[PDB]
Amino acid sequence: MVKVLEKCQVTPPSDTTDVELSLPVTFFDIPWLHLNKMQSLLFYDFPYPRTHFLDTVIPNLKASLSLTLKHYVPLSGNLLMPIKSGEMPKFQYSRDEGDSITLIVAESDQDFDYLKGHQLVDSNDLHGLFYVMPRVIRTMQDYKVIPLVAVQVTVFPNRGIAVALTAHASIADAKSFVMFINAWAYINKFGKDADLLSANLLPSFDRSIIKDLYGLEETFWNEMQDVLEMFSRFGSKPPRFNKVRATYVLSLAEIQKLKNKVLNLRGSEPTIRVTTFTMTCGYVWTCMVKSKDDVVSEESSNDENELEYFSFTADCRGLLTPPCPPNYFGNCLASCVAKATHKELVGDKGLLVAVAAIGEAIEKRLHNEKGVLADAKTWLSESNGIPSKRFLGITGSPKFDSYGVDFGWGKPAKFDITSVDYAELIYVIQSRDFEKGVEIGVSLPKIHMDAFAKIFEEGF
Numbered sequence: 201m202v203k204v205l206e207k208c209q210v211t212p213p214s215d216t217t218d219v220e221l222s223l224p225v226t227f228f229d230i231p232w233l234h235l236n237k238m239q240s241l242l243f244y245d246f247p248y249p250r251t252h253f254l255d256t257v258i259p260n261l262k263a264s265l266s267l268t269l270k271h272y273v274p275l276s277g278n279l280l281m282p283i284k285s286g287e288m289p290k291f292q293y294s295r296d297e298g299d300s301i302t303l304i305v306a307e308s309d310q311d312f313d314y315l316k317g318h319q320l321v322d323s324n325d326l327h328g329l330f331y332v333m334p335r336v337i338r339t340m341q342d343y344k345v346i347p348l349v350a351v352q353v354t355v356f357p358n359r360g361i362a363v364a365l366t367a368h369a370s371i372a373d374a375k376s377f378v379m380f381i382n383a384w385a386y387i388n389k390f391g392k393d394a395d396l397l398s399a400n401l402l403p404s405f406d407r408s409i410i411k412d413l414y415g416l417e418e419t420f421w422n423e424m425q426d427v428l429e430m431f432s433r434f435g436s437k438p439p440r441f442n443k444v445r446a447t448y449v450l451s452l453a454e455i456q457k458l459k460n461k462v463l464n465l466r467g468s469e470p471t472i473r474v475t476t477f478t479m480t481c482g483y484v485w486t487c488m489v490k491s492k493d494d495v496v497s498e499e500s501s502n503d504e505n506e507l508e509y510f511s512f513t514a515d516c517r518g519l520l521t522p523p524c525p526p527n528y529f530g531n532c533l534a535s536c537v538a539k540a541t542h543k544e545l546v547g548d549k550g551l552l553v554a555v556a557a558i559g560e561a562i563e564k565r566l567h568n569e570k571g572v573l574a575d576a577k578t579w580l581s582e583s584n585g586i587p588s589k590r591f592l593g594i595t596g597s598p599k600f601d602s603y604g605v606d607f608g609w610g611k612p613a614k615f616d617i618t619s620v621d622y623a624e625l626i627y628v629i630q631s632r633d634f635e636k637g638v639e640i641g642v643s644l645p646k647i648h649m650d651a652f653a654k655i656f657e658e659g660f
């Protein structure tokens with residue numbers, strides 16, 4: 201139901217930029233090189249005519265994106281994946297090659313209030329607002345050239361706007377990419393001389409400080425060879441998802457209720473660290489493991505002692521040596537994995553088991569002495585020995601200003617991390633309406649979603 205009105209290319213300004221920019225791939229980026237789709241969807245109430253969209257909004261967006269790209273030059277380039285053995289990946293922007301961001305201008309007749317809503321949405325409707333980027337746009341002698349960012353802007357006439365960004369995982373983590381969206385909108389909202397610095401929207405691309413003192417680069421690269429070839433010949437087009445989106449909102453008061461429920465279950469136990477993050481993920485992890493039971497598995501209690509896994513990442517910028525600036529643009533994640541027994545998660549203290557298992561995972565990865573990289577040589581080998589039916593991961597973070605992306609028409613009505621449907625993942629972001637609250641985006645088949653909503657709304 202989405203019709204494409206225009207496909208054009210957006211580049212940095214010809215003047216204040218340079219014909220070339222080689223950015224190195226750090227050992228942090230190596231584990232993400234197979235993920236060519238990281239998806240951020242933003243919805244905006246926009247009760248204005250379609251002519252105002254095409255004659256004013258679109259031209260300004262094309263102008264602000266270009267202005268923004270003067271500070272985010274590598275996002276306008278590509279990722280070069282070595283085609284010959286004994287060569288390493290890198291990033292590059294080549295103005296003489298025409299490297300640019302594809303911007304799609306589209307229109308839809310689907311119902312806008314439905315698509316930005318918090319109750320169920322067909323996943324395929326969300327994924328249908330995105331532009332499908334090519335896997336390889338060009339092939340040099342040493343490497344194959346892989347695009348990094350494309351954005352589709354869709355207009356729901358007289359009702360709203362959807363901004364659908366796709367980014368390669370290797371160029372940015374959630375923190376970095378959200379800073380890029382906010383910079384784009386900020387410049388579009390306040391013009392060219394807007395002060396990105398004073399808004400903390402200026403990135404740093406200096407990777408001379410990221411040092412690989414543990415040889416993880418060689419270690420990760422060799423381990424990624426297998427994963428890369430799997431994802432090498434896999435369909436660039438969105439699979440027909442069998443899942444529905446639902447969104448849940450936990451106020452800071454409802455977060456408090458969950459902490460006090462853990463402190464009353466504890467009943468004299470080792471001081472467990474309880475944050476919004478641990479509490480939110482704890483709660484959602486318990487509901488998720490229970491809902492898998494209510495959809496009744498024909499393996500009786502045979503499983504209950506098997507381990508359930510919750511996989512998340514953490515930002516390491518502030519833990520590195522040499523110091524790493526907070527605005528370092530790129531990947532800088534550590535892998536953390538919580539685990540507990542199925543029977544204990546579903547039991548009468550499951551919430552407490554999940555929070556302590558998560559707080560334990562953060563402590564073994566970050567609070568380790570020596571450093572975050574102390575145990576880094578196992579970050580990849582650890583996430584493999586985990587079964588698909590016992591795995592849950594989370595994407596996004598409540599720390600990032602997902603609802604600060606105001607292009608000048610107001611803050612988003614809804615921010616969806618659409619790439620959540622490709623796996624058993626959830627997403628957690630800053631709540632639009634509640635100061636220290638969160639939004640959980642869940643991605644489940646309809647019948648399983650029903651079970652989940654039951655428990656989630658239930659005991660709480």
Ligand SMILES: CC(C)(COP(=O)(O)OP(=O)(O)OC[C@H]1O[C@@H](n2cnc3c(N)ncnc32)[C@H](O)[C@@H]1OP(=O)(O)O)[C@@H](O)C(=O)NCCC(=O)NCCSC(=O)/C=C/c1ccc(O)c(O)c1
Nearest residue numbers: 238239240373374377473474475476477514515595596597
């Ligand atoms: C991992 C976390 C979240 C840990 O959470 P958390 O424990 O809440 O850390 P914190 O918020 O700094 O701590 C605050 C709490 O510390 C608590 N605390 C600290 N120590 C203790 C203690 N010892 N005992 C009890 N409490 C303690 C305090 O009580 C604080 O208050 P509160 O939170 O309860 O209100 C955090 O440290 C971190 O690193 N977060 C970043 C996660 C991250 O980087 N995720 C990125 C994944 S990439 C991703 O998912 C998607 C990328 C992407 C790209 C392009 C696209 O287009 C796209 O769409 C997507």
